[PDB]
Amino acid sequence: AIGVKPPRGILLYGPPGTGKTLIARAVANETGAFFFLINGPEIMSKLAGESESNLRKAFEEAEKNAPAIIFIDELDAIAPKREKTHGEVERRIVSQLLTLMDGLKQRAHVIVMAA
Amino acid sequence: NRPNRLIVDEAINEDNSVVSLSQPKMDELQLFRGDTVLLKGKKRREAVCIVLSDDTCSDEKIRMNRVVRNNLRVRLGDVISIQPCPDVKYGKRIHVLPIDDTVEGITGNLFEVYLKPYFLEAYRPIRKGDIFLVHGGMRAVEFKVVETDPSPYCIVAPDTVIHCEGEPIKREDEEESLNEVGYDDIGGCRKQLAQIKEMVELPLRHPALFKAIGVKPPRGILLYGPPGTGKTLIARAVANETGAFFFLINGPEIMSKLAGESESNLRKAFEEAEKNAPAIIFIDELDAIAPKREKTHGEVERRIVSQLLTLMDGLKQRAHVIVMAATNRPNSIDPALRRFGRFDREVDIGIPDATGRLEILQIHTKNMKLADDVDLEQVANETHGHVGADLAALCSEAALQAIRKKMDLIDAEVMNSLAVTMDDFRWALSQSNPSALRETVVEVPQVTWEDIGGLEDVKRELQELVQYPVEHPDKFLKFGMTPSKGVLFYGPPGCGKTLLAKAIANECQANFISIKGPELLTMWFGESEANVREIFDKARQAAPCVLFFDELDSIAKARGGAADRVINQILTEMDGMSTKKNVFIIGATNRPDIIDPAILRPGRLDQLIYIPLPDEKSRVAILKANLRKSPVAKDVDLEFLAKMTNGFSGADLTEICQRACKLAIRESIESEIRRERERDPVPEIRRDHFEEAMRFARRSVSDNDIRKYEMFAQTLQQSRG
Amino acid sequence: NEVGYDDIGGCRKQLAQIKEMVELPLRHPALFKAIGVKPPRGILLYGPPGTGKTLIARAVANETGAFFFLINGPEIMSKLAGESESNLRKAFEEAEKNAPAIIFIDELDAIAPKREKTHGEVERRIVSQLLTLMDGLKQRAHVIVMAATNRPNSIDPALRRFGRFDREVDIGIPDATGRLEILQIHTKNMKLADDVDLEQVANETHGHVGADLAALCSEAALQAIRKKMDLIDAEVMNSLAVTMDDFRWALSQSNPSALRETVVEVPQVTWEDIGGLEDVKRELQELVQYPVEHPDKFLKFGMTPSKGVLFYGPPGCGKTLLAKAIANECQANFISIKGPELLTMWFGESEANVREIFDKARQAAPCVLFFDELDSIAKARGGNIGADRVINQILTEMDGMSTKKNVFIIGATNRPDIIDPAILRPGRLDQLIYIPLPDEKSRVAILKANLRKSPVAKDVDLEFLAKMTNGFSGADLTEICQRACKLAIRESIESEIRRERERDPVPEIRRDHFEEAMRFARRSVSDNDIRKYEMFAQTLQQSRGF
Ligand SMILES: Nc1ncnc2c1ncn2[C@@H]1O[C@H](COP(=O)(O)OP(=O)(O)OP(O)(O)=S)[C@@H](O)[C@H]1O
Ligand SMILES: Nc1ncnc2c1ncn2[C@@H]1O[C@H](COP(=O)(O)OP(=O)(O)OP(O)(O)=S)[C@@H](O)[C@H]1O
Ligand SMILES: Nc1ncnc2c1ncn2[C@@H]1O[C@H](COP(=O)(O)OP(=O)(O)OP(O)(O)=S)[C@@H](O)[C@H]1O
Ligand SMILES: Nc1ncnc2c1ncn2[C@@H]1O[C@H](COP(=O)(O)OP(=O)(O)OP(O)(O)=S)[C@@H](O)[C@H]1O
Ligand SMILES: Nc1ncnc2c1ncn2[C@@H]1O[C@H](COP(=O)(O)OP(=O)(O)OP(O)(O)=S)[C@@H](O)[C@H]1O
């Protein structure tokens, strides 16, 4: 019906504390999709060299199941503007995220979501 | 020339690997009854078949069935080229593959059961990558030749042992290896695509043509502009058309690599680009790789862009390689890569216009079964500030809106009878938030020059100041004298000064860039006066063009008891423009009070034109062209209101038109309301609505202001000391 | 292949300076008895980008025959930590290992920017390594280094001391004759159609660097290829050509990259086109040209010079062209910055642009300055609070201009009341020249020098412009000439339209064209401002303190 890739990538912006985690949890536990979320500060907590570790593995685990949805939380901590990125590893992490996001196009119809 | 021109059409013969042609054109091409050809069509696809003679077939048309037409990825009506292939060798090993969604329900080998009776001494020449249909088991299953031992082309002999290794993959077998969309997938920038093709025509079909051009026109083209305009897709279409080994990399893809891994694949892409004598490469998202020194804060990215600056001119004159660039901002790239040695040429895609968006919608709604009810034209002209990827998103949202009025249990009939409506396009258009606005984009107006009351002396004066240097370049060298590039407008605040500027922009058929004074102070509010320089550079790149600086009273009212550095920047880069390039600048104000008389100097915008009140046929002329969701007023005395001078002072006679048609709106809605209450709405507008709008009317500009402008009829004598 | 001395044009003076600097690795190798200084190592080349900084160095290296070991900026900076010494020590080692030699570094801003602009420590390490190996290799085997950039003040100023990189030579933009020479040496490897002139294109191009003229030649040749039907043979190879319309097309779809640089050349305005200002011409001639071409007469008895003068009068008056006139008949290059252009760099607290302008004035001696339109600065300091801060930069920098070095300063204003009266009351800018409403024969002089698609108006009443006195308030009488142009264009399109609908263009402008042009003409300044301006005929009584 539509071959122009119905949209991969949804932002959940707005005020904090409005249950944006709860929306993704309800969607995950209702829609019947295998859910593989990862946390923002958890992967920021990793050291240099291990920062790509579990960042590649989350998208690999999304590729493991043919229906799959992930939901990254607190992307504001992950990806600020280039002026605020005075550290090299933050730019490397957001480059890895962008590379894994645009390298995977319409592969096993996965949906990514962010709050 | 090019005697292989053919048009695809419906076939008379149902043979899968045999097409039909015409006998005298076969003898023109020296063809035969059983020879083999190489049909090259769009998306650089190739098909090998055997041409049979057909008397009912046209001379300039070719007939091919659903096997050959889907082999070239073309629809009904495309253009192909035919080259006969007389050097065919015989096949030794043949490997074919099935499709996963067409093999369920039947089990067993397809070699002796399906491949054997289809190739039972059939003498069908096959091409690698082509799809052939085999009928069997009360079905029709498609199979694709993937590898042969004569790998380009062969003839299926009975002695040819055919492999039967079964690996069904997908229906999308050609979506990742090539993605072979060509110039049919790009519209709205035909001039820019033609310029890009003429730049890259030294890689393609002019290989050793450097004796005639020893300057080697530049290695490195920039494709800047707004985001989401198909800058990646332009490069993909060019690389598919040229056929050279393409080795594109992404900016974040190489920023994801570590230190030491950074030089890895950066040296390797440029080294692998050397191995082909035709070679074009491209690097994506240059702002990730090449920012300014102030933006970056790491030594690794600066070492990466230093290595890129080394490897740009480290290779020279070697296999005439061309690098290509893509970004979303022109000044964001480092100026070390804007030198004349490296990455010299800069072209901009921009956004398409209404004709361009119409072309994009027409080539985009092909792969979607509409209901054949929409017009595709109001949506085309409506979507100002909508970029092409946003147009694709609008198409997907309209498809989702058309799907969403159905059942979740899918249907027995929604897949083969899907449809979209015109109201679906309106609802997708209403609930759409594009990011392609806020840019001072280029457009050509459509403003039907008799729609004004006319001001025929002033319109002829604008004609003489603009278009006679434009349309007569011989009169720039034979007769006449020095020109006056620019004109200023002054008079009443509410008049058609913007209307005259866009009118002469349309009548000149030149580009119309109309920035705003509040928009200028908005860009200055971010502390950036180089934006005026970038506006003038966009003007020079948009040659020929017409420039408009409206609302100079907004600049004039910030005098003080902010600052007027923006008009000083404009005045500095007003006389710093060439008398060539056929650029032209229009200025306009509302009052002559604080007009900063340093800008009235000759050598700049000099002609001061005082616009008077227009004649009695101004609102007649907007009611002459009254399309405006409304019928034309009829059986009414129009000049009788001009006798009463219904706010007859400059503009805002369209205010009387708005008031009277809103009275007609009230009348029609009240008629509908008591028609609904009861259980011809008078769409035309009659005399009492115009008379009541005269009753509720006020003058727009006072007589004292008219007296002041009459006193300022000779205001070219400024700078009083 | 390799290139020599004949491929540089338009900067023969600077090229001769470079040849004189490399004359010591040449015909005078052991020139130490004549001078013991060893005149300085470290030739610094600066100016616009793409102007041939690699080409001049390579040509000088091939003429001298010395061993050339050049390195680039970002090529050296592309090495990692620990490999910055790699090839940077080794280039100087190879310069040590063979005596008659020259080395060169390109893009010095990539290697050595200012230390505040640096972020990483390896950039500081690299600039300290350069600062060690520059004067550390002193009087060893007589090697000369050369440095190229795109901007001089972006270089680290520690690299511009006496011992390091002192002889700053500017390549600059080429001249119009320099553009002609660049096109002449660029059409060697191209068989033209022998129909262009290469001169009207050259003077019609303005502010294009030699790389841009090379790109213009490429664009014209690509246009001539594009208009031809493509066929894969040599029948289009031997028939390569360029047309005059191809050069006009290449001049059209291009942009002057060297525009907005403050231009340094001599104009071509040729004194005879003045309207009849004789006393002002004689006084400006005596105050400008007389010290220049007669230095022996300017050293015996008479005039100890007092430079600096400003023009004033009506706002629409003819005061701009006289600076160009003394530039033509003084044999001095003309530098004319704009008063509106000063506030562009005043916005942002950039005081160094005026320093760069006066440094260019020092470098381009002899020269005549022209600060046009100080009334814009007066407007910025009068309409609001402030603007009037670069006018203090003007007064401070102009006292750095000594009485020698062959410089002059010309002011310009329209309303002399608010031009900050400390400008003119000391010996700085002491002289005042009134520029009145002009003499009667300006209309023929406009018609003489500006030929411009039409001859002199034949058998017309020339004296009627002195009789009816059209535009009789100051200058800008040339509005009547522009109106005659518009009426001539109207007659031409009338004849063209009539001969278009029917199936002698009349290129002569008659008396009735001027008579009709009379009606669309007014004065240029109100009479009360005229009475005030000849009330300010004696306006040197400024600093009106109570
Ligand atoms: N739309 C909602 N419907 C029902 N309960 C809600 C809703 N929004 C908020 N709540 C309640 O408020 C709580 C909000 O939980 P939080 O996790 O703190 O919200 P949050 O948005 O996930 O916080 P962050 O900062 O965005 S991770 C929920 O656990 C509910 O109890
Ligand atoms: N002119 C166009 N016609 C049709 N589809 C287009 C056009 N431009 C973009 N698209 C669609 O938009 C997507 C590609 O957009 P992009 O290549 O991302 O645009 P872009 O100009 O390259 O901006 P970037 O690269 O993301 S910064 C595909 O889905 C295309 O089908
Ligand atoms: N003589 C006229 N004939 C027809 N329509 C006119 C006429 N004068 C004004 N209008 C209409 O009124 C509008 C006024 O637009 P503008 O020219 O922008 O007004 P303005 O006098 O320039 O003042 P602003 O600040 O630009 S709104 C035009 O766009 C027309 O729609
Ligand atoms: N004086 C000149 N004579 C002949 N050709 C020239 C001249 N100046 C520039 N060119 C041409 O323009 C090109 C510029 O080459 P370069 O010398 O590398 O310029 P550049 O100044 O070193 O570049 P940057 O950006 O300033 S490092 C040359 O290769 C020639 O093709
Ligand atoms: N006596 C004259 N001789 C030659 N040209 C003159 C004469 N008087 C006026 N002109 C021309 O008239 C024009 C205006 O004179 P300018 O000195 O350039 O005016 P300006 O100093 O720029 O001040 P404004 O405010 O811009 S008119 C120039 O094109 C001059 O060449």
Residue numbers in the entry:
A (entry chain E): 232 to 346
B (entry chain D): 21 to 430, 438 to 588, 596 to 713, 726 to 767
C (entry chain C): 199 to 430, 438 to 591, 597 to 713, 726 to 768
Give verbatim excerpts from the published study on this entry:
Human p97/VCP (valosin-containing protein) belongs to the type II AAA+ (ATPase Associated with various cellular Activities) protein family, which has two AAA+ ATPase domains. p97 comprises an N-terminal domain (NTD), two ATPase domains, D1 and D2, containing conserved Walker A and B motifs, and an unstructured C-terminal tail. Six p97 monomers form a functional complex, featuring a double-ring structure based on the association of D1 and D2. IBMPFD/ALS is a genetic disorder caused by a single amino acid mutation on the p97 ATPase, promoting ATPase activity and cofactor dysregulation.
To understand how the mutation alters the ATPase regulation, we assembled a full-length p97R155H with its p47 cofactor and first visualized their structures using single-particle cryo-EM. The N-domains of the p97R155H mutant all show up configurations in ADP- or ATPγS-bound states. The NTDs showed all up configurations when bound to ATPγS or in the absence of nucleotides. The presence of the nucleotides, such as ADP or ATPγS, destabilizes the dodecameric formation. When the nucleotide is present and binds to the enzyme mutant, the p97R155H dodecamer dissociates into two functional hexamers, allowing cofactor binding and performing ATP hydrolysis. Our structures also showed that the arginine fingers exhibit different conformations than those of the wild type when p97R155H binds to p47. Our functional and structural analyses showed that the p47 binding is likely to impact the p97R155H ATPase activities via changing the conformations of arginine fingers.
